Paper text:
The entry of SARS-CoV-2 into a human cell is initiated by the recognition of the human membrane protein angiotensin-converting enzyme 2 (ACE2) by the spike (S) glycoprotein on the viral surface. S protein exists as a homotrimer with each protomer consisting of an N-terminal S1 subunit and a C-terminal S2 subunit, cleaved by host proteases (such as furin) during viral formation. Demonstrated by cryo-EM structures, the RBD in the S1 subunit is highly dynamic and adopts ‘up’ (or ‘open’) and ‘down’ (or ‘close’) states, where ‘up’ corresponds to receptor-accessible and ‘down’ corresponds to a receptor-inaccessible state. The crystal structure of n3113 in complex with the receptor-binding domain (RBD) of SARS-CoV-2, combined with the cryo-EM structures of n3113 and spike ecto-domain, reveals that n3113 binds to the side surface of up-state RBD with no competition with ACE2.
Author numbering:
A (entry chain V): 2 to 117
B (entry chain C), C (entry chain A): 995 to 1043
D (entry chain C): 14 to 251, 256 to 334, 336 to 357
E (entry chain C): 750 to 828
F (entry chain B): 358 to 620, 641 to 675, 690 to 700
The structure:
Amino acid sequence: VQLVESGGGLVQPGGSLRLSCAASDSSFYDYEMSWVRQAPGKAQEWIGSMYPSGRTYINPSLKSLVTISRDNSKNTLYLQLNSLRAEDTAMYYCVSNWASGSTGDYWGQGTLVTVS
Amino acid sequence: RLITGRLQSLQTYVTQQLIRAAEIRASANLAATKMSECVLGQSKRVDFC
Amino acid sequence: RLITGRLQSLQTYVTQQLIRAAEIRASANLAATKMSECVLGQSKRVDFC
Amino acid sequence: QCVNLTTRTQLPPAYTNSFTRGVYYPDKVFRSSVLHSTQDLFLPFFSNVTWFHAIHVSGTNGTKRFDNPVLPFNDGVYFASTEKSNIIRGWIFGTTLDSKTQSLLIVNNATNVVIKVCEFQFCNDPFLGVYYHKNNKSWMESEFRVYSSANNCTFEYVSQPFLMDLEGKQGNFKNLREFVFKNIDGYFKIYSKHTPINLVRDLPQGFSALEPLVDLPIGINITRFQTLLALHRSYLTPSGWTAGAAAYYVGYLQPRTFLLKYNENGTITDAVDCALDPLSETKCTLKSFTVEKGIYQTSNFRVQPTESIVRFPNITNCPFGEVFNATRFASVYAWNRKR
Amino acid sequence: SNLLLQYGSFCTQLNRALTGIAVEQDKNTQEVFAQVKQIYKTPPIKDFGGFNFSQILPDPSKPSKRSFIEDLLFNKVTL
Amino acid sequence: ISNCVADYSVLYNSASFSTFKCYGVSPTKLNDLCFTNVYADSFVIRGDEVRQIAPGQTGKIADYNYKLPDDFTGCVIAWNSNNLDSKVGGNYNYLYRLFRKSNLKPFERDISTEIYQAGSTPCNGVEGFNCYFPLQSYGFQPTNGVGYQPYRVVVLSFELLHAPATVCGPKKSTNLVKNKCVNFNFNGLTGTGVLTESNKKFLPFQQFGRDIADTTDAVRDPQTLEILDITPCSFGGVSVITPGTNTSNQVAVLYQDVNCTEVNVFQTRAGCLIGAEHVNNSYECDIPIGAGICASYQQSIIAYTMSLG
Ligand SMILES: *[C@@H]1O[C@H](CO)[C@@H](O[C@@H]2O[C@H](CO)[C@@H](O)[C@H](O)[C@H]2NC(C)=O)[C@H](O)[C@H]1NC(C)=O
Ligand SMILES: *[C@@H]1O[C@H](CO)[C@@H](O[C@@H]2O[C@H](CO)[C@@H](O)[C@H](O)[C@H]2NC(C)=O)[C@H](O)[C@H]1NC(C)=O
Ligand SMILES: *[C@@H]1O[C@H](CO)[C@@H](O)[C@H](O)[C@H]1NC(C)=O
Ligand SMILES: *[C@@H]1O[C@H](CO)[C@@H](O)[C@H](O)[C@H]1NC(C)=O
Ligand SMILES: *[C@@H]1O[C@H](CO)[C@@H](O)[C@H](O)[C@H]1NC(C)=O
Ligand SMILES: *[C@@H]1O[C@H](CO)[C@@H](O)[C@H](O)[C@H]1NC(C)=O
Ligand SMILES: *[C@@H]1O[C@H](CO)[C@@H](O)[C@H](O)[C@H]1NC(C)=O
Ligand SMILES: *[C@@H]1O[C@H](CO)[C@@H](O)[C@H](O)[C@H]1NC(C)=O
């Protein structure tokens, strides 16, 4: 199991939650990871992505809700979220090489973040 | 498989004890005559006593 | 089947030697006795020498 | 990461004969004043141990050399280490010591020793550092250069530290520790004891039995291990490297038969290594350390056969060519059985 | 044990033999030493023309009244 | 969770249990087998999906979410969880998928929520005509009964892979009685004998001791770390001393090298002799008992210390 998703759970509307995704190595980051979800009707828009050398770019129009951090000891991932709403009604995935389709990647476990 | 091995091992010491007993009884009969001829008398047999 | 047969065949020949050794030893004590008295002496025992 | 600079040394190892060292309890049974014979893995008496040098002792201005590289370990080895100061956190036990394989990790962490039997990505030079961070006012013990990624977390271990300080007399003892790394039926065992050293580098002739510590139910096939070290950086005490120095010894185990004395209270007072010299074999068959005058039969010896041969006759022939070297073949309704 | 009754009476031959050669050990000692009908005693005065015999006669000392020599034999084999 | 001690007997009298569904292991003998690893998964399932969610089922759910090996060695727990997944309004967050291509393999993590078509035209990433969704949400309503209610189900499925087994339960326990002939079980060591208080010294890593020839002598009690001796329960032959069947029918019995307290009564150097009265006389030996003591018959059977002459 290359990638494992940590944390998460059911979210009460008006609440907040934090995500996590332990990484097998810094080498698999090349060159775009993914904090992918399945919003209802909304297209697949990338939220969390990063680079092996330690870069970070986020979509300008959807970055008022999502924050990212890392630690290199455990290779754990931090996705500190605030003000969760109904636009997340699905179970997430943290899969490497997501942008290259849905066949050149390994699927881990993923976590559910939904509200009414 | 254990009985035919333990029984055979036990039958070895009975057999070997029997031969050892014949050794002792042969020198427990020699010690008996030497107590009758050397001690209770004077023997003329050479190199006996 | 070969191990038990060959092993058990060997135990007979050790056992027959131990019985046959005690017969030679018993005759090698008479020869020692017969040497001390008949040769190094002059025995009065009848039909001995 | 993984500062890679040796580029200078290919020196062969120093070979010595360990006088009476490598005796253990291959069981957990008390024995009174008895003499017992065991047939387990042991270091042969007076064997050529490859004396390796730890971080070198060459003092001009720092500049201590590091000439203790990767090693192989067949079935069992000894780690007789002086280590006047903490220089080894543990070792790199494993199979291939890369990704997709579980690296058996032992690390000091001298509040609680951790064993982490999981897949890792260790490089050639995992090393330590213990200094300030301008916070909490201490010399913290970060171990980040050791391992990069801790993946597929499976096993845990928390207990007392193996190594401690016991000299109390301005050194001159070095508190020698020796260790054994056996893995049979997937069970990993370690033996240790605290012993003093009076020589500058060499090993004494004293006898000491090394009690067991840990049985680990790991269950991993073993091919090769590696050694760890600790190079904390340096500061204005004349880049920043070369702290610490010691001496190491590495041997090899072999399946050997031993006759182990026992005191009235279980301590192995003495032992003898059979199959060295005729006198040792004489003691091993009689099961006695004191042998009276006489001629004793110990064993047989046969002339082992050399290269084997096989002999077979001549006239190794029929003309099979006449079947296949026919110019033309017949119709498929006229199949021929050229018997 | 109930599996052993199938082997007949091998268990009774061994007992009969060992008991047979354990009675003899009482016949070996019986034949050697027991050859006097009466227990004689040396007179309290020892006047044998100069011969001492003190090393071999029993002593008015520690029980098990063995001589000075029999004690050496009873201390050189007991291991 | 691994390398510890498991218990299942307590799980009978803990909560309100509904149906005992066990595969491959007898439910009365749950404390026998040792397995390699434990994968403790305890979660919530629907009410009718105690049967409707099960290995080897088709339709909507069991085929495509996860597959578990039909060679189970364990039990399936079934409780009543109407207060967990049924909330007013609906716990429609979870997904009861409709159909996929094929099944899975046991102990795989296949979670992908890909959309499955009914025809062949490509949606090009936009949901619309012929882009039927195989995902369907959970339907929970307090008004709905067993047909949609949730049931707490814990499945303890164990693999049959080839690996060492470490996790089992013990066989504890009883108390201790000393200085008595009892049969003991000490940490897998099975034997019988007399347990007493010792004065030896075990090193603090050993379990049991033995002197020579594999004769175990002392075993440390793993409750108090006290060394306990082992002595075999006494035995020895029994001899019948008789003055001849015509002289009398009265006999005396000798127990070969057995203390009197472990069986007139008299204690000899050759065992305990009962039925014969010891006398201070000394006669010529008649029936040799041993160690210098003989016996005879002169209207009762009496024991001497034989006189030499
Ligand atoms: C444990 O092993 C040691 C090694 O000889 C012994 O300790 C002696 O024990 C006796 C009585 O048991 C004492 O009189 C001595 O003081 C001890 N001497 C030494 C050097 O230890 C003994 O065999 C065992 N008993 C202990 C440590 O009490
Ligand atoms: C006969 O033998 C005994 C020894 O069994 C002699 O007793 C010794 O007499 C001397 C007198 O000076 C003592 O000092 C010794 O202690 C006695 N014992 C030994 C072993 O010498 C006794 O004197 C002898 N009687 C004789 C020769 O008439
Ligand atoms: C030394 O190790 C480092 C790992 O960081 C690597 O970059 C470098 O290629 C190695 N140099 C060699 C093998 O010569
Ligand atoms: C042990 O040490 C020397 C040093 O190299 C080695 O060459 C040789 O194999 C051994 N010598 C003896 C006498 O065993
Ligand atoms: C001490 O613990 C950690 C070690 O770096 C540090 O983050 C923390 O700031 C220190 N504690 C406080 C109250 O600053
Ligand atoms: C068959 O004919 C060819 C000639 O090209 C020859 O090379 C080959 O050896 C012949 N086969 C046999 C069995 O003689
Ligand atoms: C027999 O048992 C008692 C214990 O009640 C003991 O006092 C005695 O010494 C033992 N041995 C003999 C010969 O009586
Ligand atoms: C035996 O012992 C003394 C004399 O030796 C005597 O007083 C006692 O009465 C006798 N007891 C028996 C049972 O004969």
